[PDB]
Design a protein around this ligand. Structure first.
Ligand SMILES: OC[C@H]1O[C@@H](O)[C@H](O)[C@@H](O[C@@H]2O[C@H]3CO[C@@H]([C@@H]2O)[C@@H]3O)[C@H]1O
Ligand SMILES: OC[C@H]1O[C@@H](O[C@H]2[C@H]3OC[C@@H]2O[C@@H](O)[C@H]3O)[C@H](O)[C@@H](O)[C@H]1O
Ligand code: CA
Ligand code: CA
Ligand code: CA
Length: 624
């Protein structure tokens, strides 16, 4: 059994973040003004049900800007530039439409828009628009590559957006440069395999042009389709994200990636959830520290699962479950880094009827709504898909973060206190049910009530997701289902008193990315660590090694032996080509000091230590 402990009087502080951020986390890939809200739905006022009742935020949109780019006339004075007058005209037409759409204006308080360009025709590779012209491909001193694309983007933002309501749509919170560019440039079938670093320079040019027209706008990149750092023995890291940080890092306000699990690609299960995405995110942060001297805010503008083996099938509840389980796990992991995550958006769109292909009968694979007669036919009014269960599960969750601990790296836990209510969230990374023994410490009173919410799969493969919601007189034990999530809601007679603090600080090494040779000591240094009287600590070993190679180095911390656990967060990565993941190693707090030496010795040759980082948890008093 796994012991899960909730210390509800102990605030968990990370940087200056102490509270659950619903807009940052409980959101989806939509806008308040898409016309799909307003027709063909069983629920008459769908915004009120989805946005208001469930308290769900938006969003991200690429289609409006694409339509303007693809239809704008060319500047007669400057070949390869959008005409400023026609651009203003098209933007004005759209702005007028927004201004007249008064029913959506009260929902602006739920919206912080991520704007982004689709790859084509924004990337200036010669692709022509519907008006028969291509964005300038020049790369001169006065017209660096992407100048015309950048000017288009900057002018679009300036011309279309207003200050809310009758003044126009509020400005975006964040401007991503370009969606999944290296997928199109390098990796897709029949990709041209043009210059990778040219794309990175393009980001600097775009940022400068956007900020010429819109000085306060945050710009980011590179919006990576598949951040797969270990590939080609870390050659992929060295050619891509390393270079992007080196070239454009100083010019970006935020970094942005996409994170998709592959639960079923030609019958293989290749997950990021668990230790793999920890390694990806640690490598971005660690190298940012080395090169830039700071961690850059990270956006995850799309995440969950891509379901290859089900993507030529019609809709099913099971396909939605594949997405749900990835979303819940990834979300917990992003919550653990809330101080350095600026936005994380599960990839679920509202309706995307544009994505329905009448040739094949295939609807879009990530929708909040589906037609009543699906999967048999794409007919009938729209009703919620199973993805609504995510928003049902997370309903109400807010408040001050408090300390949890669970003694199984495959179980993730978190908790938030909102007055009299406490939300205790537990997620399973294991592929079997896990029996939990629950302890709630820090109050003298029993809860007045307990509501259990449990999201799991019934009936195995091709089964259905179930959201069980029930009241419990007590909850000392609970079986969490395979890859399942529960949210346990405790309600107390009076407001819960939070009277202690646990402050988490994450420290980075002076170096990274070291090759492993058998019996050869690798030495890392983590310095200026601040200790208090009482604390705990975790060393985070990012390892990228072929299968068959040891994940159990000899570890010395300040000359003292520290044991490495057999179990780490998530799966052993069997169907992946190699192992890439962070092994989390608890370390006795008394071994640590301000300047620390971490030594690793492996028994075999090959692979790399990608990163060594450390989390310190400092307590206000002797809370253990
Ligand atoms: O990298 C593996 C690929 O497998 C293919 O079977 C799949 O079609 C392909 O999907 C693509 O993935 C991202 C890049 O472009 C979109 C497309 O669906 C998506 O954003 C990819 O998964
Ligand atoms: O494919 C054209 C449509 O794309 C929609 O947005 C998509 C694209 O960017 C976000 C979202 O998903 C990605 O995979 C991209 O393909 C857009 O909303 C529509 O109006 C069309 O442009
Ligand atoms: Ca990409
Ligand atoms: Ca990559
Ligand atoms: Ca494990």
């Amino acid at each position: 059994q796994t012991h899960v402990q909730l210390n509800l009087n102990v605030k968990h502080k990370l940087g200056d973040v102490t509270e659950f951020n619903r807009p940052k986390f409980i959101n989806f890939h939509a806008t308040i003004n898409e016309n799909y809200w307003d027709s063909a739905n069983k629920i008459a006022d769908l915004r009120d049900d989805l946005i208001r009742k469930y308290d769900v935020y938006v969003g991200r949109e690429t289609g409006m800007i694409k339509t303007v780019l693809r239809n704008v006339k060319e500047d007669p004075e400057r070949p390869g530039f959008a005409d400023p007058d026609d651009l203003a005209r098209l933007c004005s037409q759209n702005k007028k439409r927004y201004v007249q759409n008064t029913k959506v204006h009260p929902y602006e308080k739920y919206s912080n828009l991520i704007l982004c360009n689709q790859f084509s025709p924004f990337y200036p590779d010669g692709t022509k628009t519907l008006k028969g012209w291509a964005l300038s491909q020049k790369d001169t001193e006065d017209e660096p590559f992407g100048t015309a694309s950048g000017e288009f983007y900057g002018r679009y933002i300036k011309e279309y957006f207003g200050e809310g309501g009758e003044s126009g749509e509020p400005k975006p919170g964040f401007c991503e440069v370009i969606n999944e560019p290296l997928w199109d440039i390098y990796d897709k079938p029949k990709a041209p395999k043009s210059s990778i670093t040219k794309l990175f320079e393009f980001h600097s040019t775009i940022a400068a042009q956007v900020k010429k027209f819109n000085p306060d706008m945050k710009v980011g990149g590179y919006c990576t389709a598949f951040p797969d750092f270990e590939l080609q023995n870390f050659g992929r890291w060295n050619a891509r994200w390393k270079q992007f940080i080196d070239i454009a890092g100083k010019d970006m306000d935020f970094f942005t990636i996409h994170l998709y699990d592959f639960p079923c690609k030609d019958g293989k299960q290749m997950y990021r959830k668990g230790s793999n995405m920890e390694a990806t995110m640690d490598m971005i942060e660690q190298y940012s520290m080395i090169k830039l001297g700071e961690v850059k805010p990270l956006m995850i503008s799309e995440y969950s699962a891509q379901t290859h083996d089900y993507n030529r099938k019609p809709w099913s509840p099971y396909r939605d479950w594949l997405r749900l389980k990835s979303t819940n796990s990834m979300l917990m992991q992003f919550m653990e880094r809330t101080d350095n995550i600026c936005y994380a958006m599960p990839f679920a769109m509202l309706k995307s009827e544009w994505g329905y292909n009448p040739k094949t009968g295939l609807a879009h694979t990530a929708r909040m709504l589906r037609r009543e007669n699906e999967p048999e036919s794409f007919t009938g009014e729209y009703v919620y898909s199973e993805l609504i269960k995510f928003y049902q599960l997370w309903k109400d969750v807010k408040g001050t973060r408090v300390e949890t601990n669970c003694d199984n790296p495959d179980i993730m836990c978190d908790a938030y206190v909102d007055g009299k209510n406490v939300y205790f969230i537990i997620n399973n990374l294991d592929f079997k049910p896990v029996d939990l023994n629950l302890s709630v410490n820090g109050t003298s009173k029993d809860a007045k009530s307990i509501e259990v919410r449990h999201l799991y799969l019934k009936g195995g493969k091709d089964g259905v997701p179930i959201l069980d919601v029930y009241d419990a007189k007590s909850l000392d034990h609970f079986t969490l289902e395979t890859e399942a999530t529960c949210v346990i809601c405790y309600n107390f007679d009076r407001k819960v008193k939070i009277n202690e603090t646990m402050e988490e600080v994450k420290y980075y090494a002076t170096d990274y990315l070291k090759e492993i040779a058998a019996g050869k000591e690798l030495v890392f240094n983590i310095n200026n660590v601040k200790k208090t009287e009482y604390g705990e600590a975790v060393i985070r070993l990012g390892l990228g090694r072929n299968h068959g190679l040891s994940l159990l180095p000899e570890l010395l911390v300040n000359g003292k032996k520290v044991d490495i656990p057999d179990n780490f967060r998530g799966d052993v990565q069997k169907d992946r080509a190699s192992f890439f993941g962070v092994i989390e190693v608890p370390v006795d707090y008394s071994i640590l000091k301000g300047n620390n030496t971490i030594s690793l010795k492996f028994p075999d040759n090959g692979g790399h230590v990608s990163t060594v980082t450390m989390q310190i948890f400092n307590f206000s008093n002797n809370i253990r």
